[PDB]
């Protein structure tokens, strides 16, 4: 009940940006100049790794505010659609609502987005 | 001169014979205060560091502060209930002051 269930499918299908979903970070992996972070996120229903963090938000990762199992609200994002049809979400602004320590576990039983 | 790969090594195997050269990224008090440190080895960063109470004067007189480079001469590793490993810093030497270093060294990423 804490996560925006169905937001991932909404973004992948409709591509609209007029939502501010609450998501859980499952994992963060750098592609290494500042590193660029890629995120596997959950909306409680699905997981998807097609998220890139805007460079401006890197300090949240580096200071451990944004870490595995934290819950965050996305305040602005940009959708980009690749030639092959895959959509990528660039996370532009977000607020960490609950720390990884506070949450403590993966929330619910999300499955990979698969449509 | 940072001991790149030392934090990963200590978290994996806890060899207290590694005398790592680390950079302090930030220091946060938990309320006398106990000081928790976010440290960097040039490759990774990690906040699972507590300063032994006896070393508090180093923080309070500003010898140990953000961006300084230090050598850890003595530490112990404890494991919490959830399995997280925490390093207790027991003896250190500040090699270069925050002012002399002036900057975060490299592009370290969180130990993952």
């Amino acid at each position: 009940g804490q996560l925006s269930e169905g937001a991932i499918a909404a973004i992948m299908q409709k591509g609209d940006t007029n939502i501010k979903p609450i998501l859980q970070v499952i994992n963060i992996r750098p592609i290494t100049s500042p590193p660029r972070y890629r995120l596997l996120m959950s909306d409680g229903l699905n997981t998807l790794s097609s998220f890139m963090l805007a460079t401006q938000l890197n300090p949240l990762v580096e200071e451990e505010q944004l870490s595995s199992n934290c819950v965050c609200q996305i305040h602005r994002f940009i959708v980009n659609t690749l030639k092959d049809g895959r959509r990528v979400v660039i996370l532009m602004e977000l607020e960490v609502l609950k720390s990884a320590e506070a949450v403590g576990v993966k929330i619910g039983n999300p499955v990979p987005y698969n449509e | 001169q940072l001991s790149e790969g030392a934090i990963a090594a200590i978290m994996q195997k806890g060899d207290t014979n590694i005398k790592p050269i680390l950079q302090v990224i930030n220091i946060r008090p938990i309320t006398p205060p106990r000081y928790r440190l976010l440290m960097s080895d040039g490759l990774n960063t990690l906040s699972s560091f507590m300063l032994a109470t006896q070393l508090n004067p180093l923080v309070e007189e500003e010898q140990l502060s953000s961006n300084c480079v230090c050598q850890i001469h003595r530490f112990i590793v404890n494991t919490l209930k959830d399995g997280r490993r925490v390093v207790i810093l027991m003896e250190l030497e500040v090699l270069k002051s925050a002012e002399a270093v002036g900057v975060k060294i490299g592009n370290p990423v969180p130990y993952n």
């Binding site: 200071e63 451990e64 505010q65 870490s67 720390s99 990884a100 320590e101 506070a102 | 930030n26 946060r28 938990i30 106990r34 928790r36 976010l38 906040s47 699972s48 507590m50 404890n78 919490l80 209930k81 997280r84 925490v86 207790i88």
Partner: peptide, 12 residues
Amino acid sequence: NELELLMEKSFW
């Protein structure tokens, strides 16, 4: 506790 309290919350 002791060390559990110092690590109970996130760094920031």
